[PDB]
Amino acid sequence: PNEPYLSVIKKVVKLSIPIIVVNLLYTVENMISMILVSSISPSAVAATGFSLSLLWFIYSLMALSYSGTNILIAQFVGAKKDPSPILINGLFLSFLISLPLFFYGKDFVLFLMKVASETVRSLAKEYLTPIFWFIPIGFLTNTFYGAYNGAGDTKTPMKVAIIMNLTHIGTAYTLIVEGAGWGIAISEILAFFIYTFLLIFFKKPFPPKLLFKMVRLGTPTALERAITTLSFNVFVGFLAKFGDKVLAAHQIGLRIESISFMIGFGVMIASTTLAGQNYGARNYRGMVHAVNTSAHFTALVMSLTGLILILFPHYLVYPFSRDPEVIEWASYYLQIVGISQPAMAYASIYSGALKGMGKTHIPLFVNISSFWLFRIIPSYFLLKVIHSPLVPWGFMTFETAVRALFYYTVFKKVVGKLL
Amino acid sequence: IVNPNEPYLSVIKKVVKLSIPIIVVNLLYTVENMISMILVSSISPSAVAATGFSLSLLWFIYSLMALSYSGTNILIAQFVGAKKDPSPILINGLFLSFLISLPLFFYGKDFVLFLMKETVRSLAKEYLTPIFWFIPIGFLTNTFYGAYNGAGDTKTPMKVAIIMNLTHIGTAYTLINGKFGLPKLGVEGAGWGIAISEILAFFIYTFLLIFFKKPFPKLLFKMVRLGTPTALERAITTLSFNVFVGFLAKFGDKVLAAHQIGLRIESISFMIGFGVMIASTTLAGQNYGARNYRGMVHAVNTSAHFTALVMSLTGLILILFPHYLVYPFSRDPEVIEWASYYLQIVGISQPAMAYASIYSGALKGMGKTHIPLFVNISSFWLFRIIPSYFLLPLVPWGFMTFETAVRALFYYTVFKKVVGKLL
């Protein structure tokens, strides 16, 4: 409402560091899994990495189960209303939409893999056979992880994520390509049963025809994620035309940015929860200042981090790559993407804040509508003059800025009609 | 346009007066595609296969075509209904298709070859080179369509469709063969024959709005937010219906022939509902903006049951005489028995395809355009694709029927709970 800086960032950080921890644990989990399957064969690593980096399209439709619950429970707890009929319907919706992935889901993935090699797909079949048996289990765990975030108790998914990733890595270590998928499956079932023992017993998540609501709210994000993975695939294929050495540096820049993506996504889910609990309580002038201060602080954090990127180029990639004409490209990458990290703070906060406010159809109209018009398209037009990979990266950096002043200038006007 | 107490006959005469031009646009297109298939069938078998899979693929490519249509079909309906000036909507709807069709221009011709997984592909190349050349013109023409059925004037797109179809004889029959001494374009002829047909309609279409001021003389985010869910409804259902045809694909070509000919015999007795659906969209839009909610309900309630009677007669014809409808298209007997057993399963659902179509169009007029997205999708899996998976050729078809019958009682209750709370 009008509580000062320290007060609002205390209520933020204590519920945003847990999501940062969860996402960084996911990063560590997948890196250690890459290392675990690296001790098999380059073909096994190819299969595993391609099948994992391809699920961001299947493992991307659960934005219904996640968002349709996260958005509603925030406004319901904010308004002090019983947020019980959403957990039941949230779990029912997750289990309902996870079924078309149980059956014709892995076959869809094999179909997409055909469009690589043939042995790689046959090994990916072994890797995905146990994963798809417990896909509704993963949908339920995701609905839980999206419901605890709405009630303002992210420490519980933090603890459960520590448990789940430890179990994942341990079971994969024991069984190790099929055991690597058994790791995911067993981790998901264990985290799900832990959530169940926490739920019905000590009602810690919480103690019926809003399927319209959560469907209509989660469908836009379910779009955004998949239609962004495809778009970024086009943008990545842009770099494939000129050389394969520069091509493999974007896969390192992925992890370099991954920590900041995880931090911003944590402070995005947190700002989502905050904006939702203020909008539901009919406390709009509260969420204005709340997201304002959260953005002002996360922008300083991101300034510091993206400045680390600029000031320490090679001295973050030495363990990764150690050869000429590589440190140059990853370095120029970081130095170019260093500037556009505060903008990622603003574009994460404001977009996640509208999500909590209910404007879930806005992100795909600021992410997809930005993207092309300012990056990809202008580098798919200029790139016939300058034949160097600095064009897509510099345009990336400029476009994250103009996207960051999309969100800001579409936030001000949305709250105007509210007052 | 219809008041809350017109005696049914009064509107039943004023809905079949308006729906018939839409029915003639939907028909004659059937003849266009039939005659084009035959003309291409006059040459190579690979040409037949390539053209068939192209038109069945250009169904999906055209799913990004409703965004300009649904954006201008619905809006104008309300704008004309609420006696508000709908001209800027017209220009911002025409300029939208063009602007949004160049993504299909340039990188979009090889996209088809990409998705089509040898001579067959090369024949698709000499086919998808001149059509995509004038594809913005076709998008604009479909937007002109949309505008005309929205404003309530469907007879003009009827005449335009007639003249375009007549442009598919000559600029086709000739350009394929070569009576005019012109070189045999081969399959490419069937390309130009489509492309050229748009140009003609463009003239007539771009003529009336200047010379005769058509019927009449920012914020397109509205139009885009309306058109995107319809594009999803027509882009995801195509995909996911192929996941249902995989069910029947497990019995050989003799059942694929049954389903493929069912598509045809169906289509013949399909345009009725799609025409009345566009008409009911227009009616519900023109009454929603005019605050005539009771009259809107009365119109949709009367037209739904009238179309139910018509489709009951139609399904009865399909059930009583299936053998004679398949005799034109099949000589292998087992195919005959499968197609007859199929039409007896569809003809039942025919009356239930009137309520679905009418209520589907009706909720489009009154903004709510995400309804048919999560109504026609959450029904596939839940009722036709899964309950057929757990019981496995009459199981999948008999569940198709009752799915598009439970889609009736689902479209309705939503419609009634939405429209009773309008009052």
PDB file of N, CA and C in Angstrom, chain A residues 74-122:
ATOM      1  N   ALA A  74      -4.067 -16.768  -6.309  1.00  0.00           N
ATOM      2  CA  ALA A  74      -3.543 -15.504  -5.799  1.00  0.00           C
ATOM      3  C   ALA A  74      -4.673 -14.521  -5.513  1.00  0.00           C
ATOM      4  N   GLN A  75      -5.561 -14.314  -6.490  1.00  0.00           N
ATOM      5  CA  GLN A  75      -6.682 -13.401  -6.294  1.00  0.00           C
ATOM      6  C   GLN A  75      -7.656 -13.916  -5.243  1.00  0.00           C
ATOM      7  N   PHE A  76      -7.757 -15.236  -5.077  1.00  0.00           N
ATOM      8  CA  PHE A  76      -8.699 -15.768  -4.098  1.00  0.00           C
ATOM      9  C   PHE A  76      -8.168 -15.643  -2.674  1.00  0.00           C
ATOM     10  N   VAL A  77      -6.874 -15.892  -2.470  1.00  0.00           N
ATOM     11  CA  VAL A  77      -6.291 -15.688  -1.151  1.00  0.00           C
ATOM     12  C   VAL A  77      -6.234 -14.204  -0.833  1.00  0.00           C
ATOM     13  N   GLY A  78      -6.007 -13.364  -1.846  1.00  0.00           N
ATOM     14  CA  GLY A  78      -6.005 -11.931  -1.614  1.00  0.00           C
ATOM     15  C   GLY A  78      -7.351 -11.418  -1.141  1.00  0.00           C
ATOM     16  N   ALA A  79      -8.433 -11.929  -1.727  1.00  0.00           N
ATOM     17  CA  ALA A  79      -9.787 -11.545  -1.350  1.00  0.00           C
ATOM     18  C   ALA A  79     -10.310 -12.314  -0.142  1.00  0.00           C
ATOM     19  N   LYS A  80      -9.465 -13.118   0.507  1.00  0.00           N
ATOM     20  CA  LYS A  80      -9.832 -13.902   1.683  1.00  0.00           C
ATOM     21  C   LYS A  80     -10.978 -14.867   1.400  1.00  0.00           C
ATOM     22  N   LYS A  81     -11.143 -15.266   0.144  1.00  0.00           N
ATOM     23  CA  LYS A  81     -12.135 -16.263  -0.224  1.00  0.00           C
ATOM     24  C   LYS A  81     -11.518 -17.653  -0.160  1.00  0.00           C
ATOM     25  N   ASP A  82     -12.372 -18.655   0.047  1.00  0.00           N
ATOM     26  CA  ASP A  82     -11.944 -20.045   0.134  1.00  0.00           C
ATOM     27  C   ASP A  82     -11.371 -20.502  -1.202  1.00  0.00           C
ATOM     28  N   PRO A  83     -10.063 -20.719  -1.289  1.00  0.00           N
ATOM     29  CA  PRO A  83      -9.460 -21.104  -2.569  1.00  0.00           C
ATOM     30  C   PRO A  83      -9.357 -22.612  -2.720  1.00  0.00           C
ATOM     31  N   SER A  84     -10.351 -23.317  -2.192  1.00  0.00           N
ATOM     32  CA  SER A  84     -10.425 -24.771  -2.239  1.00  0.00           C
ATOM     33  C   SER A  84     -10.977 -25.293  -3.566  1.00  0.00           C
ATOM     34  N   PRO A  85     -12.060 -24.727  -4.121  1.00  0.00           N
ATOM     35  CA  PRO A  85     -12.598 -25.277  -5.379  1.00  0.00           C
ATOM     36  C   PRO A  85     -11.668 -25.131  -6.571  1.00  0.00           C
ATOM     37  N   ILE A  86     -10.553 -24.419  -6.435  1.00  0.00           N
ATOM     38  CA  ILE A  86      -9.605 -24.295  -7.536  1.00  0.00           C
ATOM     39  C   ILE A  86      -8.565 -25.412  -7.516  1.00  0.00           C
ATOM     40  N   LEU A  87      -8.152 -25.855  -6.328  1.00  0.00           N
ATOM     41  CA  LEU A  87      -7.207 -26.965  -6.241  1.00  0.00           C
ATOM     42  C   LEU A  87      -7.816 -28.250  -6.792  1.00  0.00           C
ATOM     43  N   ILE A  88      -9.072 -28.535  -6.435  1.00  0.00           N
ATOM     44  CA  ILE A  88      -9.749 -29.719  -6.962  1.00  0.00           C
ATOM     45  C   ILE A  88      -9.853 -29.634  -8.477  1.00  0.00           C
ATOM     46  N   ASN A  89     -10.378 -28.515  -8.979  1.00  0.00           N
ATOM     47  CA  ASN A  89     -10.506 -28.348 -10.419  1.00  0.00           C
ATOM     48  C   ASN A  89      -9.147 -28.221 -11.093  1.00  0.00           C
ATOM     49  N   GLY A  90      -8.155 -27.650 -10.407  1.00  0.00           N
ATOM     50  CA  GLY A  90      -6.823 -27.581 -10.988  1.00  0.00           C
ATOM     51  C   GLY A  90      -6.220 -28.955 -11.207  1.00  0.00           C
ATOM     52  N   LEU A  91      -6.312 -29.818 -10.191  1.00  0.00           N
ATOM     53  CA  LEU A  91      -5.819 -31.182 -10.335  1.00  0.00           C
ATOM     54  C   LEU A  91      -6.619 -31.950 -11.379  1.00  0.00           C
ATOM     55  N   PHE A  92      -7.945 -31.781 -11.382  1.00  0.00           N
ATOM     56  CA  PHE A  92      -8.766 -32.461 -12.377  1.00  0.00           C
ATOM     57  C   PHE A  92      -8.391 -32.026 -13.786  1.00  0.00           C
ATOM     58  N   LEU A  93      -8.159 -30.729 -13.985  1.00  0.00           N
ATOM     59  CA  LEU A  93      -7.776 -30.225 -15.298  1.00  0.00           C
ATOM     60  C   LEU A  93      -6.404 -30.739 -15.707  1.00  0.00           C
ATOM     61  N   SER A  94      -5.454 -30.756 -14.770  1.00  0.00           N
ATOM     62  CA  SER A  94      -4.135 -31.298 -15.071  1.00  0.00           C
ATOM     63  C   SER A  94      -4.234 -32.752 -15.510  1.00  0.00           C
ATOM     64  N   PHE A  95      -4.934 -33.575 -14.727  1.00  0.00           N
ATOM     65  CA  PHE A  95      -5.083 -34.982 -15.079  1.00  0.00           C
ATOM     66  C   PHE A  95      -5.867 -35.158 -16.371  1.00  0.00           C
ATOM     67  N   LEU A  96      -6.780 -34.234 -16.666  1.00  0.00           N
ATOM     68  CA  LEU A  96      -7.602 -34.345 -17.862  1.00  0.00           C
ATOM     69  C   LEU A  96      -6.783 -34.061 -19.115  1.00  0.00           C
ATOM     70  N   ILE A  97      -5.989 -32.989 -19.094  1.00  0.00           N
ATOM     71  CA  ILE A  97      -5.212 -32.627 -20.279  1.00  0.00           C
ATOM     72  C   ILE A  97      -3.891 -33.376 -20.374  1.00  0.00           C
ATOM     73  N   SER A  98      -3.463 -34.053 -19.308  1.00  0.00           N
ATOM     74  CA  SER A  98      -2.270 -34.879 -19.403  1.00  0.00           C
ATOM     75  C   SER A  98      -2.528 -36.195 -20.122  1.00  0.00           C
ATOM     76  N   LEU A  99      -3.796 -36.602 -20.249  1.00  0.00           N
ATOM     77  CA  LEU A  99      -4.102 -37.884 -20.884  1.00  0.00           C
ATOM     78  C   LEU A  99      -3.743 -37.896 -22.364  1.00  0.00           C
ATOM     79  N   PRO A 100      -4.062 -36.872 -23.169  1.00  0.00           N
ATOM     80  CA  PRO A 100      -3.626 -36.889 -24.579  1.00  0.00           C
ATOM     81  C   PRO A 100      -2.116 -36.910 -24.754  1.00  0.00           C
ATOM     82  N   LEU A 101      -1.349 -36.772 -23.675  1.00  0.00           N
ATOM     83  CA  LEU A 101       0.088 -37.003 -23.710  1.00  0.00           C
ATOM     84  C   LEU A 101       0.468 -38.395 -23.232  1.00  0.00           C
ATOM     85  N   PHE A 102      -0.336 -38.986 -22.347  1.00  0.00           N
ATOM     86  CA  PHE A 102      -0.130 -40.377 -21.960  1.00  0.00           C
ATOM     87  C   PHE A 102      -0.152 -41.280 -23.189  1.00  0.00           C
ATOM     88  N   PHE A 103      -1.239 -41.225 -23.960  1.00  0.00           N
ATOM     89  CA  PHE A 103      -1.377 -42.058 -25.148  1.00  0.00           C
ATOM     90  C   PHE A 103      -0.581 -41.485 -26.315  1.00  0.00           C
ATOM     91  N   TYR A 104      -1.234 -40.663 -27.137  1.00  0.00           N
ATOM     92  CA  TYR A 104      -0.613 -40.087 -28.330  1.00  0.00           C
ATOM     93  C   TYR A 104       0.190 -38.846 -27.931  1.00  0.00           C
ATOM     94  N   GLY A 105       1.273 -39.100 -27.203  1.00  0.00           N
ATOM     95  CA  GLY A 105       2.188 -38.051 -26.807  1.00  0.00           C
ATOM     96  C   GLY A 105       3.619 -38.429 -27.117  1.00  0.00           C
ATOM     97  N   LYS A 106       4.014 -39.636 -26.708  1.00  0.00           N
ATOM     98  CA  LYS A 106       5.347 -40.129 -27.039  1.00  0.00           C
ATOM     99  C   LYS A 106       5.455 -40.459 -28.522  1.00  0.00           C
ATOM    100  N   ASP A 107       4.370 -40.966 -29.115  1.00  0.00           N
ATOM    101  CA  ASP A 107       4.354 -41.208 -30.553  1.00  0.00           C
ATOM    102  C   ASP A 107       4.469 -39.901 -31.325  1.00  0.00           C
ATOM    103  N   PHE A 108       3.847 -38.837 -30.813  1.00  0.00           N
ATOM    104  CA  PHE A 108       4.034 -37.514 -31.397  1.00  0.00           C
ATOM    105  C   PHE A 108       5.502 -37.104 -31.359  1.00  0.00           C
ATOM    106  N   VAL A 109       6.189 -37.415 -30.256  1.00  0.00           N
ATOM    107  CA  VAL A 109       7.593 -37.041 -30.117  1.00  0.00           C
ATOM    108  C   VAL A 109       8.462 -37.835 -31.084  1.00  0.00           C
ATOM    109  N   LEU A 110       8.186 -39.134 -31.240  1.00  0.00           N
ATOM    110  CA  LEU A 110       8.927 -39.931 -32.217  1.00  0.00           C
ATOM    111  C   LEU A 110       8.680 -39.433 -33.637  1.00  0.00           C
ATOM    112  N   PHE A 111       7.422 -39.110 -33.956  1.00  0.00           N
ATOM    113  CA  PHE A 111       7.092 -38.491 -35.235  1.00  0.00           C
ATOM    114  C   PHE A 111       7.933 -37.245 -35.472  1.00  0.00           C
ATOM    115  N   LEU A 112       8.000 -36.365 -34.471  1.00  0.00           N
ATOM    116  CA  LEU A 112       8.770 -35.134 -34.615  1.00  0.00           C
ATOM    117  C   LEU A 112      10.266 -35.413 -34.735  1.00  0.00           C
ATOM    118  N   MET A 113      10.762 -36.447 -34.051  1.00  0.00           N
ATOM    119  CA  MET A 113      12.170 -36.815 -34.165  1.00  0.00           C
ATOM    120  C   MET A 113      12.508 -37.337 -35.554  1.00  0.00           C
ATOM    121  N   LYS A 114      11.575 -38.041 -36.199  1.00  0.00           N
ATOM    122  CA  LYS A 114      11.823 -38.487 -37.566  1.00  0.00           C
ATOM    123  C   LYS A 114      12.050 -37.301 -38.495  1.00  0.00           C
ATOM    124  N   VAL A 115      11.242 -36.255 -38.356  1.00  0.00           N
ATOM    125  CA  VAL A 115      11.377 -35.064 -39.184  1.00  0.00           C
ATOM    126  C   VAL A 115      12.577 -34.240 -38.731  1.00  0.00           C
ATOM    127  N   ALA A 116      19.440 -35.658 -37.169  1.00  0.00           N
ATOM    128  CA  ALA A 116      19.057 -36.822 -36.378  1.00  0.00           C
ATOM    129  C   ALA A 116      19.509 -38.118 -37.045  1.00  0.00           C
ATOM    130  N   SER A 117      18.858 -39.213 -36.678  1.00  0.00           N
ATOM    131  CA  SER A 117      19.146 -40.543 -37.208  1.00  0.00           C
ATOM    132  C   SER A 117      17.993 -41.455 -36.806  1.00  0.00           C
ATOM    133  N   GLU A 118      18.154 -42.754 -37.048  1.00  0.00           N
ATOM    134  CA  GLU A 118      17.170 -43.745 -36.637  1.00  0.00           C
ATOM    135  C   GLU A 118      17.517 -44.389 -35.303  1.00  0.00           C
ATOM    136  N   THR A 119      18.802 -44.653 -35.056  1.00  0.00           N
ATOM    137  CA  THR A 119      19.205 -45.231 -33.779  1.00  0.00           C
ATOM    138  C   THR A 119      18.957 -44.254 -32.636  1.00  0.00           C
ATOM    139  N   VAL A 120      19.185 -42.962 -32.883  1.00  0.00           N
ATOM    140  CA  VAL A 120      18.950 -41.942 -31.867  1.00  0.00           C
ATOM    141  C   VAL A 120      17.496 -41.962 -31.416  1.00  0.00           C
ATOM    142  N   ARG A 121      16.568 -42.091 -32.366  1.00  0.00           N
ATOM    143  CA  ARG A 121      15.152 -42.156 -32.018  1.00  0.00           C
ATOM    144  C   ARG A 121      14.835 -43.429 -31.244  1.00  0.00           C
ATOM    145  N   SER A 122      15.494 -44.537 -31.590  1.00  0.00           N
ATOM    146  CA  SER A 122      15.237 -45.791 -30.892  1.00  0.00           C
ATOM    147  C   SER A 122      15.761 -45.754 -29.460  1.00  0.00           C
TER     148      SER A 122
END
